[PDB]
Amino acid sequence: MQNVLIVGVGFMGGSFAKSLRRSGFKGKIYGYDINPESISKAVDLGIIDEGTTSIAKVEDFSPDFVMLSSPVRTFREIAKKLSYILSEDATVTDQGSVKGKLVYDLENILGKRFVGGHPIAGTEKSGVEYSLDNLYEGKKVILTPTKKTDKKRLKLVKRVWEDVGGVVEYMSPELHDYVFGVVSHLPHAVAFALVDTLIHMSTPEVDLFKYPGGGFKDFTRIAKSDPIMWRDIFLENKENVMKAIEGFEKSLNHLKELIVREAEEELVEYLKEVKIKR
Template sequence: MEKKVVYIAGLGLIGASLALGIKRAHPNLTILGYNRSEASRIIALERGMVDQVTDDFASFAPIADVIILALPIKQTKSYLDILARLPLKDQVLVTDVGSTKAEIVAHADQVFQDQAVRFVGGHPMAGSHKTGAAAADETLFENAYYIFTPSSQTKAGSIENLKELLSGLRSRFIEINAEEHDRVTSQISHFPHLLATTLVEQAVAYGEEHPLANRFAAGGFRDMTRIAESEPGMWTSILLSNPHAILERIADFKERLDQVAETIQADNQEAIWTFFYEGRKHRQEMQIHQPAGRDSAYHLFIDVPDKEGVILEILQLLQGISLVNIHINEENREDIHGILQLTFRQAEDQKRAQELIQKATSYTVLAR
């Protein structure tokens, strides 16, 4: 890739990880960074994520060939306004990373109208419960969907330019309409976060009268509510920037719950069985088992004895295999298959680890 200047505004988890991924494929590019927090600016410089940093957003924008706004949704819109007033390079390429797209794309079309600016809406569908530049990870976007939502400002070749720039992320690039993006993500991303948080709040309230509910919360509850730990400010912005689609999903879910309640009240054993059977069948048919980002994880559950050194024994067997996470399930084993849970990003790593453990030990190993 020819020598370019890339300007990343926002050096949090997403922006800093983008910088690392871009550097991996294009080490000779100049990457400039903006962040209000001095701590993130220092980390980004010290780890070589960026070549220069600033706390004045407007200062680097005029010299950039590509500008990436890795900012919250509302802030992204205000920074688009700032860019529209600056003397930017001719045909500068501007993109964002917002989790909703229609509002941002419409705003960009408005502010850049009749300007020599190429805008492409962007949404890398990956993340972590960690935040800030300190949590940056060049592998964060591997196998994740990276969605582009074209606008009237998306000139010919713009998306191809972005794909080349972001090739080091090793993502799965896809283009869709901004409105359709928001409808789809309301179902598979936004509503699940809302549901997870509601489930946690319900359990907490229930636990006031039944304290054992919190202690007995096992694998199913844990897996369903993990995303309730996400950053509140980000999800407030997401809900308020995509309200119609999300409200429609809530109404639809209420109707489905009412149908289940009616089936239980009617003591309809056949209908209840069909409900669970269809749910299992449909989930097995979904593409969620294919590699598509951080949430497409591969787990091993290992039934290990409670003795000193057993975890170290397992980890020594897996030297050279990339692990995403290690979890020790101590309290409740109702619906998990082992006390030691290992998580991998690639199915090949999971398979290799299972083979090694089964060959070297007598422990029961279950892949999920």
């Protein structure tokens, strides 16, 4: 591994390249992006050594390790092109926020080269300009092996993520989507809706946006995330997202009934759930 290729040189792609370099990688870091400015900026910042917007020129880089960091919706089309360009011994992995069937689709396109991944490290910022060289430190990184996953490549990807500080753990592609549908997608949905609530509950008399405190702002900081990306995530993992919103509403409606009936003792018990050493 001496030629790494960053596909999609934005916040995540750039953060991975910076982290890899800072961890001591001495090989070449190349970039591929459809946006010319992305490539230019990354080269200026020293995030990548060289880049291009022409997929065909990538063969000139002879990549042995590819990190898919563009929007998930672009993976399949990009993977098909890489299948003709990349040597069979190369390794291709990703940072996509969703896994599920995507993983099997990429395996069918790329064969043994593919290893699905998702670093649990977020941001509300976009673009390579905001890239960080320690973004993954202490953050979990979910790799999603399947029966067909290549043992050696999985081990390699794990080591690379550990080299940048990730806390690697494995989940099937399906389990990943369920888990994060509840622990990440649902919370984001709740944050978006909480902000939307203040829009509708404000009156020509009072503008609720004038009174948000810390509890409110902390809970809604993720509502500043990229709209296009979350529109994508919500649709890409819609089955689990629908189930998670439904489950949440079941819990909220239970709290609601406790409040309406003024069930003092049970209400306290419900609220005490927020304790637990876990």
